[PDB]
Design an enzyme around this catalytic site. Structure first.
Site, mmCIF file in Angstrom:
data_model
loop_
_atom_site.group_PDB
_atom_site.id
_atom_site.type_symbol
_atom_site.label_atom_id
_atom_site.label_comp_id
_atom_site.label_asym_id
_atom_site.label_seq_id
_atom_site.Cartn_x
_atom_site.Cartn_y
_atom_site.Cartn_z
ATOM 1 N N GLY C 144 0.809 -1.207 0.000
ATOM 2 C CA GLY C 144 0.000 0.000 0.000
ATOM 3 C C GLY C 144 0.844 1.260 0.000
ATOM 4 O O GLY C 144 0.498 2.253 -0.646
ATOM 5 N N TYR C 224 13.541 -12.995 2.249
ATOM 6 C CA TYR C 224 13.754 -11.662 1.693
ATOM 7 C C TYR C 224 15.226 -11.276 1.729
ATOM 8 O O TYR C 224 15.705 -10.576 0.830
ATOM 9 C CB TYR C 224 12.913 -10.626 2.443
ATOM 10 C CG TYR C 224 11.457 -10.610 2.038
ATOM 11 C CD1 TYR C 224 11.087 -10.711 0.704
ATOM 12 C CD2 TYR C 224 10.452 -10.503 2.992
ATOM 13 C CE1 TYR C 224 9.754 -10.699 0.326
ATOM 14 C CE2 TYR C 224 9.117 -10.492 2.625
ATOM 15 C CZ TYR C 224 8.775 -10.591 1.293
ATOM 16 O OH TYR C 224 7.448 -10.578 0.925
ATOM 17 N N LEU C 252 21.868 10.138 -15.124
ATOM 18 C CA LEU C 252 20.537 9.546 -15.232
ATOM 19 C C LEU C 252 19.899 9.826 -16.584
ATOM 20 O O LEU C 252 19.133 8.999 -17.092
ATOM 21 C CB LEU C 252 19.638 10.067 -14.113
ATOM 22 C CG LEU C 252 20.086 9.802 -12.678
ATOM 23 C CD1 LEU C 252 19.109 10.436 -11.700
ATOM 24 C CD2 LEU C 252 20.220 8.310 -12.423
ATOM 25 N N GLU C 254 21.260 9.692 -19.415
ATOM 26 C CA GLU C 254 21.743 8.738 -20.406
ATOM 27 C C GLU C 254 20.962 7.430 -20.388
ATOM 28 O O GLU C 254 20.912 6.739 -21.410
ATOM 29 C CB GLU C 254 23.232 8.474 -20.180
ATOM 30 C CG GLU C 254 23.967 7.954 -21.401
ATOM 31 C CD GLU C 254 25.452 8.262 -21.361
ATOM 32 O OE1 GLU C 254 25.854 9.114 -20.538
ATOM 33 O OE2 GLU C 254 26.211 7.655 -22.150
HETATM 34 N N1 LIG Z 1 12.132 -8.629 -3.171
HETATM 35 C C1 LIG Z 1 11.548 -8.179 -2.063
HETATM 36 N N2 LIG Z 1 10.178 -8.027 -2.041
HETATM 37 C C2 LIG Z 1 9.564 -7.569 -0.934
HETATM 38 C C3 LIG Z 1 10.291 -7.244 0.202
HETATM 39 N N3 LIG Z 1 9.418 -6.818 1.140
HETATM 40 C C4 LIG Z 1 8.167 -6.868 0.624
HETATM 41 N N4 LIG Z 1 8.245 -7.344 -0.658
HETATM 42 C C5 LIG Z 1 7.140 -7.541 -1.608
HETATM 43 O O1 LIG Z 1 6.331 -6.385 -1.558
HETATM 44 C C6 LIG Z 1 4.962 -6.730 -1.616
HETATM 45 C C7 LIG Z 1 4.284 -6.247 -0.342
HETATM 46 O O2 LIG Z 1 4.437 -4.853 -0.239
HETATM 47 P P1 LIG Z 1 5.338 -4.164 0.901
HETATM 48 O O3 LIG Z 1 6.514 -3.428 0.294
HETATM 49 O O4 LIG Z 1 5.794 -5.184 1.914
HETATM 50 O O5 LIG Z 1 4.267 -3.177 1.594
HETATM 51 P P2 LIG Z 1 4.523 -1.608 1.834
HETATM 52 O O6 LIG Z 1 5.130 -0.937 0.625
HETATM 53 O O7 LIG Z 1 5.399 -1.451 3.053
HETATM 54 O O8 LIG Z 1 3.066 -0.978 2.089
HETATM 55 P P3 LIG Z 1 2.141 -1.332 3.366
HETATM 56 O O9 LIG Z 1 0.861 -1.947 2.847
HETATM 57 O O10 LIG Z 1 1.840 -0.039 4.078
HETATM 58 O O11 LIG Z 1 2.861 -2.284 4.293
HETATM 59 C C8 LIG Z 1 4.890 -8.237 -1.738
HETATM 60 O O12 LIG Z 1 4.763 -8.545 -3.106
HETATM 61 C C9 LIG Z 1 6.233 -8.694 -1.215
HETATM 62 O O13 LIG Z 1 6.626 -9.916 -1.791
HETATM 63 C C10 LIG Z 1 11.671 -7.390 0.192
HETATM 64 O O14 LIG Z 1 12.330 -7.104 1.194
HETATM 65 N N5 LIG Z 1 12.295 -7.863 -0.946
#
Ligand SMILES: Nc1nc2c(ncn2[C@@H]2O[C@H](COP(=O)(O)OP(=O)(O)OP(=O)(O)O)[C@@H](O)[C@H]2O)c(=O)[nH]1
Ligand SMILES: Nc1ncnc2c1ncn2[C@@H]1O[C@H](COP(=O)(O)OP(=O)(O)CP(=O)(O)O)[C@@H](O)[C@H]1O
Ligand SMILES: Nc1nc2c(ncn2[C@@H]2O[C@H](COP(=O)(O)OP(=O)(O)O)[C@@H](O)[C@H]2O)c(=O)[nH]1
Ligand SMILES: CC(C)N(C)c1ncnc2c1cnn2C
Ligand SMILES: [Ca+2]
Ligand SMILES: [Ca+2]
Ligand SMILES: [Ca+2]
Ligand SMILES: [Mg+2]
Ligand SMILES: [Mg+2]
Ligand SMILES: [Mg+2]
Lengths: 54, 425, 438, 348
Positions: C144, C224, C252, C254
């Site tokens: 979100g 993760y 950037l 480029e």
């Molecule tokens: N590759 C990778 N993907 C992540 C990581 N953390 C979350 N995700 C991915 O991000 C998505 C979930 O969104 P988040 O980034 O965790 O949520 P947010 O941006 O903090 O937003 P909120 O809803 O407020 O928690 C899922 O698809 C997860 O698999 C990470 O550390 N590495």
């Protein structure tokens, strides 16, 4: 298979190979979208409280 | 610091709530006096979710005990972990509710509700950032049903943007106290349809059948039934009370489990459920097959009679997470006719390294299934069998209610059943 | 020397940002305390690494980075982590409660109340830059915050820094490593509102990173931490040109010039090789030809798709390690006679090659083995449209029933924004088909 | 329990394969839009290959090779043979063909007329045929004016004025071969072929009546007056056709024809292997092909076209369809001989 624009430095080099030639919303407008959505939230919550007052 | 405020109302609500705090207190290393005596930092990582920290390193549950008669709460205050509750958080009357929703909601209950909200406001004011509330109660009586839904209505008015969850025990004629339970449950369900985000439906008949058929208990007591509820409540709150690779508060859980606002009634389940062949190690395939088996479900609804909108499975203990995904992806990919195809990947899995007390590993099931309509169908049919003759109505009209309000509760219930029906085809 | 500010939004952005700055420090010889022994100019200097690091009079090398999250738990690890000393408190911004995987909550409800604070903290870093280039924005599609607040920030950055480039590193949602069901909504909502504000976006599909970690690193169930260490290697390969002496992709601007002839089609496909398991007894070092050939295997792409059935608009080869131009050109010729490399008729059939002699730095105790040479290919293929198709299909399935829509409308978003965003994706898919198919 | 979906209700072939799969009690059919499947029996046109191989834990297989259309399209086949060094422009087993776009829309108009005038001047047989996705004329003016009257791309190729005629009847024919390519890109040739014979005597002095020149099963069963006289349904199977070659020409079907057929199938499929192979792909492909061959009076085989969604002879549906399940499906999803196919080995 030409090499063009070859640049060399101490930490690397870069070049280009050509195999074949070819053939916004202002700051005011963002505030309205944000405030418009906040107003709809206020409307919905007011209809909830009115419902609860009934 | 995402605190949850817990509220337990009425006889059922307080007896089930009591055991709940008994179970999780053990899991967090809190003894009956509120002193921590665990051996793992995981027990305190998210302890403040359900417990306040007083001076002297004492942890006091963030729980509010409500009832219109003293009896049941006197039992809690004398029970195993009775001393652990804040003395000021016992709010009770003397008249009782006579298993009458109108008394809990309009007359006796209204006289007491303000002082209950005074305590709630006190616990909320002390929260860094309140997640939401959870209410344990039955729907067949008068206090937990009538005054519980009154409390919910007033909590929503004062905290409109907080999550409201309930563990709601639905009545069944097989395990019944009075004949008016269908009246009380129907009046409550409409309140829950409007003012809760997530309701875990717990059916006393399912709890009974599990104790008799699977658990081999000849003549189950209310204590036996509540043991299943405790274990289930501990399961559904695992990914809230312990640290893990899942960062989920009540709101984020609701967002992913409730595709439609009124269809927020869940079927919970637990595995294993072994009779005393109890020390046998349970393999991952067995956990998975049992967790999806109806006999391990507590709503008394056959999932094969409807379709899953969303499913959440929580696995506890040290096990092969790779082998969990295989069996989980085996259940779905072997019975995809019972999952809706218009919500991609609507079956999610979570893990927790800390297993419950006395178990190498367990699984808790949380299903938002359209089969729950069968539960509301039963209630509606019992309601109409009496209401067509206006039987037992005088207990309610004597408290100021009118027949029109019953007709409206009937329609609201049948509309709910109709809403589930369309999402099943 | 021109400065680059990195912005990390949400859990995915922040944790990925944490892994990159760990790698950057190992690459530039910066210790966790911020000190850099080889930097003979104390408290100043306009070197290449200064594009990403400022300097205090005491010699601390401070990242030009801002971390933002609507909840504090992820950014708290940075505050108490190994590299807590690098950042000062003004760079770390945390809210009280997150967006609950609800785009509308991050964009409208919460974002509206914290956007001005974030801009202020970014303005502070900008005031330290003698010639700010632009921004690198890391975030997830599915969260979100990563979806909803990012799009709001991008809109305001375009207003506050009109002439500045903005690049993205976006995490594409993969069910195998996600417990969220509404991510297709968030992904399409944020792409619609970010499209006109991003000059170049590198999508990384978690599904691809996941399989590379199981296939090449022998991780049965990657975490993760594993995914982010691999992702930070790819990011490092892409940003190395900005942080080291060189002549390719020096600013950037480029990246757009060399990779995006059509503005809306600004999503290059990234491919990386080799990824060798550290636990291996000892791997045979791969040649320039073999690692270059690997750049055309779907298994090493950041987004699983089939470039044999698209058209290329650009292609960059970024080598790190023991590589000389002679060996690059030899392997390329071999690949042309073997592979399906079809270019769009209005674009030259060529390859821009950059070589950095310093081989990939590997984090001690990490999963990746030290290799003598690695390469990252940045190609703009129409094949990446397969990812938009997959995502748009999932969106359609849920939106046909209005499933979960009430959560968004409840936060002040109009239902019309769903259809307006989906129709923008339908036009994006049509653009790809006009450039690629005959 | 294996799951599959059916997305081409008109396929007579995979309709039988889907009927067999359910007969094993180990395959389950799902709604055509359910993404949790192992096997897809996909649609002919616009099959969404991009949505395959992205369901966690599911190994997914599809009955079409993405990109095989290059071989199964009239104009595409011509371009592939002329531009692929593996086949070259001097490919000896493919009739001289040219791609011609209608004037109302690169194009090979001028190149065609060059070779045309060369034949007309050299007294050579200058009869060509036009077709797309039919007209047989000896004058280029008629062939070109017929394409401009349409609106789609066409192809003009030399007409085999010396076809091998079966006796009695003095009648033309064509040979259909079914080829199955599995996920490992093994090329299997169904041991059973079919000759679709013309029930009318071949006539070289009148290309106006296309009933003795076009051996399509639908034209013979619709515009011919000797349908089913010499063989049931104008379909002669290998057993008879081989026995004929021995009595008449004193040769075998293997030596005189099959060697060339197997060579042609290999060359075509090996050529496009780098472009359509699913070896290192997130999903797997297999496809049934229908090659159409012509034989001249010198016993030289010519490739007419390749079909990507072929039908089968009624007598050979059970055998071939079962063979598809044995090597194409169960080889990836095994169940709880003397093969009917001929493996055409090659270098990958
Ligand atoms: N590759 C990778 N993907 C992540 C990581 N953390 C979350 N995700 C991915 O991000 C998505 C979930 O969104 P988040 O980034 O965790 O949520 P947010 O941006 O903090 O937003 P909120 O809803 O407020 O928690 C899922 O698809 C997860 O698999 C990470 O550390 N590495
Ligand atoms: N160059 C050529 N010389 C002689 N005959 C030819 C020819 N091209 C086509 N034919 C005749 O036309 C018939 C094949 O036509 P073609 O295959 O192009 O149409 P089609 O593809 O719609 C039928 P199908 O695809 O079902 O086999 C054969 O029976 C053959 O006798
Ligand atoms: N599972 C369970 N159900 C109970 C318990 N006590 C009562 N019930 C059920 O709850 C309903 C009666 O409501 P009750 O809680 O006693 O009324 P209240 O005190 O006015 O709220 C009936 O359907 C009972 O079967 C209990 O301890 N456990
Ligand atoms: C959103 C769902 C699918 N997830 C990930 C969950 N995971 C663990 N416990 C949960 C949930 C939901 N409710 N509860 C109690
Ligand atoms: Ca009173
Ligand atoms: Ca310096
Ligand atoms: Ca812009
Ligand atoms: Mg009672
Ligand atoms: Mg978050
Ligand atoms: Mg055809």
């Amino acid at each position: 298979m030409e090499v063009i624009e070859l640049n060399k430095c101490t930490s690397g080099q870069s070049f280009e190979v050509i195999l074949k030639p070819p053939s916004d919303p202002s700051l005011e407008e963002i505030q309205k979208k944000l405030e418009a959505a906040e107003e709809r939230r206020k409307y919905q919550e007011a209809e909830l409280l009115k419902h609860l007052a009934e | 610091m995402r605190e949850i405020v817990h509220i337990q109302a009425g006889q059922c609500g307080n007896q089930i709530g009591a055991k709940f705090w008994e179970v999780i207190s053990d899991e967090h290393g809190i003894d009956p006096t509120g002193s921590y005596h665990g051996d793992s930092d995981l027990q305190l990582e998210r302890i403040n979710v359900y417990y306040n920290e007083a001076t002297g390193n004492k942890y006091v549950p963030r729980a509010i005990l409500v009832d219109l008669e003293p009896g049941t709460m006197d039992s809690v205050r004398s029970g195993p972990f009775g001393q652990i509750f804040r003395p000021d958080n016992f709010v009770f009357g003397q008249s009782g509710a006579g298993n009458n929703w109108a008394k809990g909601h309009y007359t006796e209950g209204a006289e007491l509700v303000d002082s209950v909200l005074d305590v709630v406001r006190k616990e909320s004011e002390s929260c860094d950032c309140l997640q939401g509330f959870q209410l344990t109660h039955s729907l067949g009586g008068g206090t937990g049903s009538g005054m519980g839904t009154l409390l919910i209505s007033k909590i929503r008015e004062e905290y409109p943007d907080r999550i409201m969850n309930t563990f709601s025990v639905m009545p069944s004629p097989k395990v019944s106290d009075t004949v008016v339970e269908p009246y009380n449950a129907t009046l409550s369900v409409h309140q829950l349809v409007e003012n809760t985000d997530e309701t875990y439906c717990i059916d006393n008949e399912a709890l009974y059948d599990i104790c008799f058929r699977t658990l081999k208990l000849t003549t189950p007591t209310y204590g036996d039934l509540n043991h299943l509820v405790s274990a289930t409540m501990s399961g559904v709150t695992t990914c809230l009370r312990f640290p893990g690779q899942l960062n989920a508060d009540l709101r984020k859980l609701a967002v992913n489990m409730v595709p439609f606002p009124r269809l927020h009634f869940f079927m919970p389940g637990f595995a294993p459920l072994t009779s005393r062949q109890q020390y046998r190690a349970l393999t991952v395939p067995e956990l998975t097959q049992q967790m999806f088996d109806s006999k391990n479900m507590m709503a008394a609804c056959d999932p094969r009679h409807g379709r899953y909108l969303t499913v959440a499975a929580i696995f506890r203990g040290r096990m092969s997470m790779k082998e969990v995904d295989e069996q989980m992806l085996n259940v779905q990919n072997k019975n995809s006719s019972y999952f809706v195809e218009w919500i991609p990947n609507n079956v999610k899995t979570a893990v927790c390294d800390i297993p419950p007390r006395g178990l190498k590993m367990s699984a808790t099931f949380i299903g938002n299934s359209t089969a729950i309509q069968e539960l509301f169908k039963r209630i509606s049919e019992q309601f109409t069998a009496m209401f067509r003759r206006k039987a037992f109505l005088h207990w309610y009209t004597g408290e100021g209610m009118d027949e029109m309000e019953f007709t409206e509760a009937e329609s609201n219930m049948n509309d709910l059943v109709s809403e589930y029906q369309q999402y099943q085809d | 020397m021109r400065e680059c500010i990195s912005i990390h939004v949400g859990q995915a952005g922040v944790q990925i940002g944490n892994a990159c700055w760990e790698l950057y420090c190992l690459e530039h010889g910066i210790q966790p305390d911020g000190q850099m022994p080889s930097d003979k100019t104390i408290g100043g200097g306009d070197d290449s690494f200064n594009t990403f690091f400022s300097e205090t009079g005491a010699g601390k090398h401070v990242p030009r980075a801002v971390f933002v999250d609507l909840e504090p738990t992820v950014i708290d690890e940075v505050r108490t982590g190994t590299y807590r000393q690098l950042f000062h408190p003004e760079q770390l911004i945390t809210g009280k409660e997150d967006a609950a995987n609800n785009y509308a909550r991050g964009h409208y409800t919460i974002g509206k109340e914290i956007i001005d604070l974030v801009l202020d903290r970014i303005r502070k870093l900008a005031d330290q830059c003698t010639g700010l280039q632009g921004f690198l924005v890391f975030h997830s599609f599915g969260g979100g915050t990563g979806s909803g607040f990012t799009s709001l920030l991008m809109e305001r950055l375009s207003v506050d820094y009109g002439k500045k480039s903005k690049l993205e590193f976006s995490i594409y949602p993969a069910p195998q490593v996600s417990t969220a069901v509404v991510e297709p909504y968030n992904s399409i909502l944020t792409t619609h509102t970010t499209l006109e504000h991003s000059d170049c976006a590198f999508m990384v599909d978690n599904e691809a990173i996941y399989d590379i970690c199981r296939r090449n690193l022998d991780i049965e169930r990657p975490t993760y931490t594993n995914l982010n260490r691999l992702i930070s290697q790819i990011v490092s390969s892409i940003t190395a040109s900005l942080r080291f002496d060189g002549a390719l992709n020096v600013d950037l601007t480029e990246f757009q010039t060399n990779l995006v002839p059509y503005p809306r089609i600004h999503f290059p496909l990234a491919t990386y090789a080799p990824v060798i398991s550290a636990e291996k007894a000892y791997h045979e070092q791969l040649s320039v030809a073999e690692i270059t050939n690997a750049c055309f295997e779907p298994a090493n792409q950041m987004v699983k798709c089939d470039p044999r059935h698209g058209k290329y608009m650009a292609c960059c080869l970024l080598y790190r390690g023991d590589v000389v131009p002679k060996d690059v050109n030899a392997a390329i010729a071999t690949i042309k006679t073997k592979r399906s490399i079809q270019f769009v008729d209005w674009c030259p059939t060529g390859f821009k090659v950059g070589i950095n002699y310093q081989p990939p730095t590997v984090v001690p105790g990490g999963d990746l083995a030290k290799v003598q040479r690695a390469v990252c290919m940045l190609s703009n293929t129409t094949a990446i449209a397969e990812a938009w198709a997959r995502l748009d299909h999932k969106f359609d399935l849920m939106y046909a029933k209005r499933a979960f829509v009430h959560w968004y409308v409840g936060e002040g978003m109009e239902e019309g924004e769903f259809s307006e965003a989906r129709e923008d994706m339908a036009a994006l898919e049509k653009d790809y088909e006009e450039v690629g198919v005959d | 329990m294996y799951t599959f979906v059916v997305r081409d209700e008109n396929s007579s072939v995979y309709a039988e394969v889907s009927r067999l799969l359910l007969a094993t009690g180990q395959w389950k059919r799902l709604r055509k839009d359910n993404p949790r499947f192992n096997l897809m029996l996909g649609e002919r046109n616009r099959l969404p290959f991009g949505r395959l191989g992205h369901e966690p834990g599911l190994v997914q297989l599809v009955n079409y090779y993405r990109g095989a259309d290059k071989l199964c399209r009239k104009a595409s086949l011509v371009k592939l043979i002329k531009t692929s060094p593996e086949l070259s422009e001097s490919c000896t087993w493919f009739p001289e063909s040219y791609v011609i776009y209608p004037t109302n829309l690169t194009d090979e108009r001028e190149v065609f007329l060059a070779a045309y005038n060369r034949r007309r001047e050299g007294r050579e047989g200058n009869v060509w045929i036009a077709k797309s996705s039919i007209l047989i004329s000896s004058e280029a003016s008629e062939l070109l004016d017929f394409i401009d009257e349409q609106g789609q791309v066409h192809v003009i190729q030399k007409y085999l004025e010396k076809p091998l005629l079966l006796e009695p009847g003095h009648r033309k024919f064509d040979i259909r071969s079914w080829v199955l390519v599995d996920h490992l890109y093994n090329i299997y040739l169904y041991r059973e072929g079919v000759l679709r014979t013309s029930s009318e005597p071949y006539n070289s002095a009148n290309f106006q009546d296309k009933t003795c020149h076009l051996t399509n099963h639908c034209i013979q069963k619709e515009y011919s007056k000797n349908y089913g006289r010499y063989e049931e349904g104008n379909e002669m199977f290998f057993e008879e056709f081989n026995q004929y070659l021995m009595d008449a020409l004193n040769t075998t079907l293997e030596n005189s024809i099959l060697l060339q057929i197997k060579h042609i199938i290999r060359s075509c499929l090996m050529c496009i292997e780098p472009a359509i192979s699913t070896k290192h792909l997130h999903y797997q492909s297999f496809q049934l092909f229908g090659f159409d061959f012509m034989v001249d009076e010198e016993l030289k085989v010519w490739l007419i076209e390749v079909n990507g969604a072929p039908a089968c002879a009624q007598k050979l549906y059970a055998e071939l369809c079962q063979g598809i399940v044995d090597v194409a499906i169960s080889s990836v999803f095994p169940l709880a001989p003397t093969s009917i196919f001929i493996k055409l080995h090659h270098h990958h």
